């Protein structure tokens, strides 16, 4: 089989029948930190106990680091071919919470920052939410791409807390003053473990977290219920009070539609294929949008260009042809899972490097892959 796994943020999408095409084993959600290790080191033990199996791909919403790419380039690429890192879909980062009240919870970004730094310890600190009592933060214990997508936002926008947030996959390491300021914060494993903590009715109300929008409510419409999933973006712009937005996909899709492609000359570098957001545009970073829902980013796929086995090569190509298809694609399933499909120019760019047979970067390229490729 073709074996993949990793990021839990898109796990429900990849588990949806026919999103992964023929030859693909069921996706194993274990966190982006472990998905990267499984792929980069060919360590199926990060996915399960049957270590006779080889790893063929991973889902990750944590970008490959300069060290990870350099190591794979030195150690693995000569035998197995270049790695490919490409965006899969775009996503918001949702902020669900368990705190009763009729009023809409609408976090300003300042309030968001204070909740997650521990500066704001009580729901009364949120204007307009009509709620009072202790807030208890739930966060991911393990190396998590959702934590990376979220702390990249905090690092960019939380600029007037006592401390500052570093970009990281481990939430406990992000804030410079540590988690100590946060009374009774609770760690949980995977997107499912986080929601189970958030929804645990055996404990006092007050919990809040950051999570995949596909896990933050039981249906798409639940993402618009501001008595359970926070709006984010409340503020005053040009003197006029403005309401924040829900984390519904429609509220981040416009900002995603204008993220520019990497330049043609750079497309052999897997680092340029995953856009990341920041305070300002510069150096391939895209500024976080001042309209729509503010916390967004990409979750990605990591594949090999070359597979030793010719059937797997073909099945990997057929997957790309669907997931990046102009038509006959996975876009309805992507929408159904609270994500934003890649813009058509992105899909076309991915096909043109990684599918088009004459391109030297393409999966299973005769000349480049001959004699090479990951084990079956």
Short mmCIF file of C-alpha atoms in Angstrom, two decimals, residues 148-346:
data_model
loop_
_atom_site.label_atom_id
_atom_site.label_comp_id
_atom_site.label_asym_id
_atom_site.label_seq_id
_atom_site.Cartn_x
_atom_site.Cartn_y
_atom_site.Cartn_z
CA UNK A 148 2.62 26.47 14.34
CA UNK A 149 -0.23 28.16 12.29
CA UNK A 150 -1.58 29.71 15.53
CA UNK A 151 1.67 30.90 17.14
CA UNK A 152 2.79 32.41 13.85
CA UNK A 153 -0.30 34.64 14.23
CA UNK A 154 0.37 35.42 17.90
CA UNK A 155 3.98 36.22 17.12
CA UNK A 156 2.85 38.63 14.40
CA UNK A 157 0.01 40.38 16.24
CA UNK A 158 0.40 40.00 19.98
CA UNK A 159 2.75 42.94 20.34
CA UNK A 160 1.67 44.54 23.64
CA UNK A 161 1.60 41.62 26.11
CA UNK A 162 4.11 41.43 28.95
CA UNK A 163 6.00 38.73 27.09
CA UNK A 164 6.11 37.68 23.41
CA UNK A 165 5.11 34.49 21.51
CA UNK A 166 7.74 32.61 19.47
CA UNK A 167 6.64 30.65 16.40
CA UNK A 168 6.80 26.97 17.42
CA UNK A 169 5.06 23.57 17.10
CA UNK A 170 5.03 23.18 20.92
CA UNK A 171 2.58 25.64 22.55
CA UNK A 172 4.18 25.29 26.02
CA UNK A 173 7.36 26.78 24.56
CA UNK A 174 5.84 29.74 22.70
CA UNK A 175 5.27 32.57 25.21
CA UNK A 176 8.57 34.03 26.53
CA UNK A 177 7.29 33.95 30.16
CA UNK A 178 6.09 30.31 29.79
CA UNK A 179 2.66 28.87 30.69
CA UNK A 180 3.01 29.80 34.38
CA UNK A 181 0.79 32.90 33.91
CA UNK A 182 -1.99 30.61 32.79
CA UNK A 183 -3.86 29.10 35.75
CA UNK A 184 -4.78 25.43 35.24
CA UNK A 185 -4.08 25.28 31.50
CA UNK A 186 -4.67 21.73 30.22
CA UNK A 187 -2.61 19.92 27.52
CA UNK A 188 -4.21 17.33 25.19
CA UNK A 189 -3.02 15.15 22.30
CA UNK A 190 -4.36 15.50 18.73
CA UNK A 191 -7.23 17.64 17.42
CA UNK A 192 -9.64 15.00 18.80
CA UNK A 193 -8.04 15.06 22.32
CA UNK A 194 -8.28 18.85 22.36
CA UNK A 195 -11.99 18.83 21.53
CA UNK A 196 -12.69 16.05 24.02
CA UNK A 197 -11.04 18.27 26.74
CA UNK A 198 -12.93 21.34 25.49
CA UNK A 199 -16.27 19.50 25.63
CA UNK A 200 -15.58 17.57 28.92
CA UNK A 201 -18.74 18.22 30.97
CA UNK A 202 -17.20 16.68 34.16
CA UNK A 203 -15.28 19.92 34.75
CA UNK A 204 -16.29 23.55 35.29
CA UNK A 205 -17.27 25.61 32.22
CA UNK A 206 -14.66 28.13 31.01
CA UNK A 207 -12.35 26.21 28.60
CA UNK A 208 -11.19 27.75 25.31
CA UNK A 209 -8.77 26.45 22.68
CA UNK A 210 -7.38 26.82 19.11
CA UNK A 211 -8.14 24.06 16.61
CA UNK A 212 -8.87 22.90 13.07
CA UNK A 213 -12.19 24.35 11.93
CA UNK A 214 -13.15 20.82 10.82
CA UNK A 215 -13.15 19.80 14.53
CA UNK A 216 -14.37 23.04 16.16
CA UNK A 217 -18.14 22.36 15.63
CA UNK A 218 -20.14 19.28 14.64
CA UNK A 219 -21.41 20.85 11.44
CA UNK A 220 -20.38 23.73 9.12
CA UNK A 221 -23.17 25.95 10.47
CA UNK A 222 -21.88 25.44 14.09
CA UNK A 223 -18.81 27.53 13.13
CA UNK A 224 -21.14 30.53 12.87
CA UNK A 225 -22.56 30.02 16.37
CA UNK A 226 -20.74 32.72 18.36
CA UNK A 227 -22.03 31.35 21.65
CA UNK A 228 -19.70 28.29 21.02
CA UNK A 229 -17.05 29.34 18.42
CA UNK A 230 -15.57 32.84 18.85
CA UNK A 231 -15.68 35.50 16.17
CA UNK A 232 -12.26 37.19 15.93
CA UNK A 233 -11.48 40.71 14.55
CA UNK A 234 -13.65 43.09 16.66
CA UNK A 235 -12.13 46.59 16.57
CA UNK A 236 -12.45 50.11 15.15
CA UNK A 237 -11.24 50.79 11.65
CA UNK A 238 -11.26 54.34 10.21
CA UNK A 239 -13.22 55.43 13.27
CA UNK A 240 -16.08 52.95 12.69
CA UNK A 241 -16.64 49.96 15.12
CA UNK A 242 -16.31 46.65 13.19
CA UNK A 243 -17.40 43.14 14.22
CA UNK A 244 -15.06 40.18 13.96
CA UNK A 245 -15.79 37.21 11.63
CA UNK A 246 -16.48 33.48 12.23
CA UNK A 247 -13.70 31.04 11.23
CA UNK A 248 -15.91 29.72 8.43
CA UNK A 249 -13.94 28.95 5.25
CA UNK A 250 -15.74 31.71 3.33
CA UNK A 251 -14.20 34.29 5.69
CA UNK A 252 -10.59 33.37 4.81
CA UNK A 253 -11.03 32.40 1.19
CA UNK A 254 -10.57 35.93 -0.25
CA UNK A 255 -7.20 36.50 1.44
CA UNK A 256 -6.09 33.01 0.20
CA UNK A 257 -7.19 33.88 -3.38
CA UNK A 258 -4.52 36.59 -3.64
CA UNK A 259 -1.46 34.75 -2.19
CA UNK A 260 1.08 34.96 -5.04
CA UNK A 261 2.71 31.86 -6.58
CA UNK A 262 6.39 31.16 -6.02
CA UNK A 263 8.54 32.45 -8.92
CA UNK A 264 9.21 29.86 -11.65
CA UNK A 265 12.95 29.95 -11.03
CA UNK A 266 12.51 28.87 -7.39
CA UNK A 267 10.08 25.99 -7.90
CA UNK A 268 12.81 23.30 -7.40
CA UNK A 269 13.00 24.57 -3.75
CA UNK A 270 10.31 22.95 -1.54
CA UNK A 271 10.52 25.85 0.94
CA UNK A 272 8.92 28.37 -1.47
CA UNK A 273 5.81 26.25 -2.09
CA UNK A 274 4.29 26.82 1.35
CA UNK A 275 3.31 30.45 1.90
CA UNK A 276 3.39 31.65 5.51
CA UNK A 277 1.79 34.79 6.87
CA UNK A 278 3.33 37.43 9.14
CA UNK A 279 2.95 41.04 10.26
CA UNK A 280 4.14 42.43 6.96
CA UNK A 281 4.68 41.29 3.43
CA UNK A 282 8.28 40.78 2.57
CA UNK A 283 10.70 37.99 1.69
CA UNK A 284 7.99 35.62 0.51
CA UNK A 285 5.99 36.16 3.77
CA UNK A 286 2.41 37.37 3.20
CA UNK A 287 0.86 39.87 5.58
CA UNK A 288 -2.07 38.62 7.65
CA UNK A 289 -5.27 40.10 6.08
CA UNK A 290 -6.87 43.17 7.57
CA UNK A 291 -10.27 41.97 6.37
CA UNK A 292 -12.15 38.66 6.78
CA UNK A 293 -11.22 36.18 9.54
CA UNK A 294 -7.65 36.99 10.58
CA UNK A 295 -6.04 33.63 11.56
CA UNK A 296 -5.36 31.50 8.54
CA UNK A 297 -2.68 29.50 6.77
CA UNK A 298 -1.92 26.34 4.69
CA UNK A 299 -1.77 22.63 5.52
CA UNK A 300 0.54 20.72 3.22
CA UNK A 301 1.56 17.45 1.64
CA UNK A 302 5.10 15.96 1.62
CA UNK A 303 5.76 13.34 -1.06
CA UNK A 304 8.72 11.94 -2.90
CA UNK A 305 9.33 12.71 -6.55
CA UNK A 306 10.38 9.10 -7.11
CA UNK A 307 9.10 5.70 -5.91
CA UNK A 308 10.99 2.46 -6.53
CA UNK A 309 7.69 0.72 -7.33
CA UNK A 310 6.10 1.63 -10.69
CA UNK A 311 2.45 0.92 -9.59
CA UNK A 312 2.90 3.28 -6.59
CA UNK A 313 4.43 5.94 -8.83
CA UNK A 314 1.29 5.82 -11.03
CA UNK A 315 -1.08 5.84 -8.02
CA UNK A 316 0.70 8.83 -6.55
CA UNK A 317 0.36 10.60 -9.91
CA UNK A 318 -3.33 9.75 -10.09
CA UNK A 319 -3.79 11.22 -6.57
CA UNK A 320 -2.14 14.51 -7.63
CA UNK A 321 -4.19 14.58 -10.80
CA UNK A 322 -7.38 14.46 -8.65
CA UNK A 323 -6.33 16.64 -5.69
CA UNK A 324 -4.91 19.35 -8.11
CA UNK A 325 -7.43 18.67 -10.94
CA UNK A 326 -9.03 21.52 -12.86
CA UNK A 327 -12.16 19.28 -12.65
CA UNK A 328 -12.84 15.80 -11.22
CA UNK A 329 -11.17 17.02 -8.09
CA UNK A 330 -11.60 16.97 -4.26
CA UNK A 331 -12.95 20.52 -3.92
CA UNK A 332 -16.56 19.61 -2.73
CA UNK A 333 -15.02 17.30 -0.01
CA UNK A 334 -12.53 20.09 0.95
CA UNK A 335 -15.45 22.56 1.35
CA UNK A 336 -17.50 19.99 3.26
CA UNK A 337 -14.58 19.76 5.73
CA UNK A 338 -14.48 23.56 6.49
CA UNK A 339 -11.40 24.28 4.37
CA UNK A 340 -10.56 26.51 1.41
CA UNK A 341 -9.67 24.80 -1.87
CA UNK A 342 -6.39 25.94 -3.47
CA UNK A 343 -6.98 28.76 -6.05
CA UNK A 344 -6.91 27.50 -9.69
CA UNK A 345 -3.51 29.18 -10.41
CA UNK A 346 -2.03 27.25 -7.44
#
